[PDB]
Amino acid sequence: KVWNARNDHLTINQWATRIDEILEAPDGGEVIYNVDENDPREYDAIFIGGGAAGRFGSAYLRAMGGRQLIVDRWPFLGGSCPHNACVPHHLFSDCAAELMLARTFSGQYWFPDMTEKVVGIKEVVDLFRAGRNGPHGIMNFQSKEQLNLEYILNCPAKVIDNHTVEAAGKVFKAKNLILAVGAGPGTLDVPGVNAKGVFDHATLVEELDYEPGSTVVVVGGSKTAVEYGCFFNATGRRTVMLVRTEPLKLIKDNETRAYVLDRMKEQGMEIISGSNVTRIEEDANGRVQAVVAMTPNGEMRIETDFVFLGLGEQPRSAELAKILGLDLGPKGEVLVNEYLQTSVPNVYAVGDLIGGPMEMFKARKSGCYAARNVMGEKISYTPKNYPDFLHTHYEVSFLGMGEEEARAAGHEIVTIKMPPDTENGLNVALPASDRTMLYAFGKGTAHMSGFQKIVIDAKTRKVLGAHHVGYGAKDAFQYLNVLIKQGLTVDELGDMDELFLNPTHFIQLSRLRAGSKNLVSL
Amino acid sequence: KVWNARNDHLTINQWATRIDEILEAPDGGEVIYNVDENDPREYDAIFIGGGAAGRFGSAYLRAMGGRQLIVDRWPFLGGSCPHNACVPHHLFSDCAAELMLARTFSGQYWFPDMTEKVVGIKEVVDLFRAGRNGPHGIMNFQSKEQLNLEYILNCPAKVIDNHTVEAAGKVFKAKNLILAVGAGPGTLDVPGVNAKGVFDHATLVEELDYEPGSTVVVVGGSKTAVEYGCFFNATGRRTVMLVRTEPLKLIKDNETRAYVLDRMKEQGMEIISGSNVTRIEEDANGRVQAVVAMTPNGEMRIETDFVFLGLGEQPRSAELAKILGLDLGPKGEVLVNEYLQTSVPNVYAVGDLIGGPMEMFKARKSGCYAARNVMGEKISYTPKNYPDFLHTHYEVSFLGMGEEEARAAGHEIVTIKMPPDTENGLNVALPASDRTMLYAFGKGTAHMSGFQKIVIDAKTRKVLGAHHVGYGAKDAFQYLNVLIKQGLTVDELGDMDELFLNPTHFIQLSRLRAGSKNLVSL
């Protein structure tokens, strides 16, 4: 039951295969024990959980010359991301974007006829399940062979006290504990929620044994709900989203949000805000048959055999809080100070366990900062002024302030956007670049070529916000945000070297206005 | 024959329509006269040509409060870019990328069967011709209504002397002249070069009245030759590229270049280096029937009815050099100093007219700098250390030094790349992100998921070069390059906020190594 893999050296593909076998193992599989029993040093920290936060924290701690140990109940490192979160989500979004293109130019050129064409959801999920072990293999390999990490996988950790942990039937002592067990799927307190056909991101890639009907009901207005919803709609199914409040409040710029929502509705998606599910109807077979919810316009009933819950995740703090006596927050999040320290001495908390923002950059960075503090390097971490994004059928990127938001805050501003405000509106061949060229040139599709805008302070000439809808700008926003935080002006932006045609046209458009001492919008 | 449009206000779509009509006008069309005859001020500069360089230079000069006049023989502003250069090229590249995806997953999921499927080239070119007026319309509109520019279109300029120009049958005086007539297609001195079926970027979108056969011969190893070549290959045609020297020398990093070339050959492209065309065979109908070229392995003959020339363009300096007495360079380029000034007083030269690099950022920026000098603001411009890119079936981005190049230069370096160097090689599920997820998860397609690398100086910890093959990183390279020129280290890169999954993984991968005082490659 315990496999000492320490002296074993599997390739990425061999790891992939071994992990799949352990995952399919009916008896549960063997414990993956990778500990250096010859090293006499004491553990500086034991990480409970080896996901994004735990794996990166360990990587950084080891890199600094300290000793660590990861314990994870899964037979692979990397956490939810490669198994049921970020990775599968991006596979689905890719399909959503490709399908919108195929449906828009159905029949034309090399595109097949999509009319009355329904794509198999289970087919795609099966594709994911069949290949998710690839990333898993790289993670175990990279972690062991390249990052020199010690770890025990496929084994739930038993925390004794703030310096003691049991794993693989053994007791380990450490100077510190770093809690990185993340968060779990949100629950919905309504009858029928356990009926067959009700899924969340986690169970979707584990229990989908049938192909969904023609209608899909998504509950939630989160990124996940929108991302998965656009994919389901792209497969050719009627998709209804039930949002408690208003959708995509995360997109502060009003025009940007309207463009995104307008394009979603144009694809046939139905978004009902101010709605609360009251009951999920089960048929005689214990299968979902319909959803009932209360809306501003009253109660409605939608027939469906497939329901996807996109609620927020909740920190896995219950057990740990009891064993260690940790102070918890309003939403079950473990409370920590600016150094990631919990209320218990020598115990840190990172990742989704400490709340939002629940993003990979937050998990990985908090993990590394906790490690640095553990190694004596006092450093604080408080995420703020970061870029963000989400997928619909398009890639949506945003940072800083929206146009209205900036004016309300007292900033005199001018904006540079595309397309321009004219009586032709969105119906013009711009913006345009990689992956939006067909839309830009197609008959009646120009309005689908995208939308983008930068918000500038008229007096300081500094960029206060950037927004983009299309493809190929997400990566750019990572670096653009750094420049903006350093104080980027329209003149400096205009003096850069653009790579035309560019997903973001901020550089050359800025150059067109930068010559005036008195800025004017474009 | 002369239409005074000054007081007319057409919409973007009305401009699009009017331009198309003038372009199709058998008699040649009317002159578009947009001059403010009430303005008593003298012209600070008259721009000969209203393309990228001329339009931007005018925009900036006007923005600074000076008076300008553009004269262009075409009925639209924007130059070659929207009519036969950058724009059509990106439309074709989009098709190339989409077709590779469709052929790789032929039949599977929603993808139709591509086996024995040939895409119509003329169909796509016709699509471009049908919609190119959209961008044209925005240019005339934006220029007139938003940038307040004065211009005379659909009228060749007659330069009298360094202060005098005739347009629309009238004489105009200016304090300066800014030459921005760009460059024209390179010529090939071999028999049969004028046979029907021989095209270059300019004639391809004007004279393609038939659908090409099963084989295509591309002459040149430039970006254009490679970009158009991958598109022709993607349509399902045997594509043979005849390169005089070696292909893609522009990609300095050896591993990056090899990955790009390997993927092209995998798609079925045949690249013959050290080859020189000796003759283009004409059939009894004056149509191309075959191409003969000398190669390192001897003379070869390729049957084909379609030949695309991707030679370098040549500056349109002949006439101007004679009229004004301009000193010219080895390749016909107009010589200028660091202020864009020619050998003739009060005469500047910009864009493709002054040589390489022949890119949009160079054209636009040189145009603006010439304008600033004309307005009394002495500023020098010398393009260097800029990012660059090109299309194959993938987007290829690069900046700075290649790995070998850096070591040769005396830099002690480490590299961070994906996928890693292991016995499984490229056959792993990384790198991966938007538009490469299917390749990453498909059976036998993992090696197609991409390639990327950053070159770092082991001692200074500074990034010396970045390279990427895939999709969605081009835009990022514009901003990343600015950070690198400001002195970016692996630690600073590692401290940024990534947006996972990201086209470039430089941020988190840097973070994985930044913890060590002694850097180690990944």
Ligand SMILES: Cc1cc2nc3c(=O)[nH]c(=O)nc-3n(C[C@H](O)[C@H](O)[C@H](O)COP(=O)(O)OP(=O)(O)OC[C@H]3O[C@@H](n4cnc5c(N)ncnc54)[C@H](O)[C@@H]3O)c2cc1C
């Ligand atoms: C559907 C979905 C899509 C997302 N898309 C994105 C995206 O595009 N971009 C982005 O930046 N973020 C995205 N996120 C969020 C991101 O996945 C998380 O913020 C991040 O994975 C959290 O990392 P973590 O290390 O804190 O937790 P996790 O990665 O969730 O891992 C916690 C780890 O601890 C282990 N563990 C738990 N309990 C125990 C125990 N008792 N004993 C031992 N081990 C235990 C787990 O098995 C797991 O390996 C998405 C999330 C979801 C749900």
Ligand SMILES: Cc1cc2nc3c(=O)[nH]c(=O)nc-3n(C[C@H](O)[C@H](O)[C@H](O)COP(=O)(O)OP(=O)(O)OC[C@H]3O[C@@H](n4cnc5c(N)ncnc54)[C@H](O)[C@@H]3O)c2cc1C
């Ligand atoms: C196939 C192809 C693809 C390309 N792809 C890219 C790319 O992806 N990215 C990039 O950055 N660059 C690209 N380039 C290069 C880029 O298009 C040029 O560098 C840029 O257009 C040059 O701008 P310009 O203003 O100097 O000339 P243009 O060549 O921009 O215009 C010159 C102008 O002068 C006018 N003119 C000429 N003679 C006269 C006359 N006698 N009287 C009046 N007007 C006259 C013309 O009609 C025209 O409007 C590409 C080029 C080609 C050929």
Ligand SMILES: O=S(=O)(O)CCS
């Ligand atoms: O953040 S990790 O690299 O552990 C997993 C991403 S797939």
Ligand SMILES: O=S(=O)(O)CCS
């Ligand atoms: O893209 S990354 O290499 O960071 C993670 C994949 S497991």
Ligand SMILES: O=S(=O)(O)CCS
């Ligand atoms: O003239 S500009 O360079 O703005 C645009 C050509 S698409």
Ligand SMILES: O=S(=O)(O)CCS
């Ligand atoms: O994208 S840009 O507006 O710079 C040029 C389109 S003509």
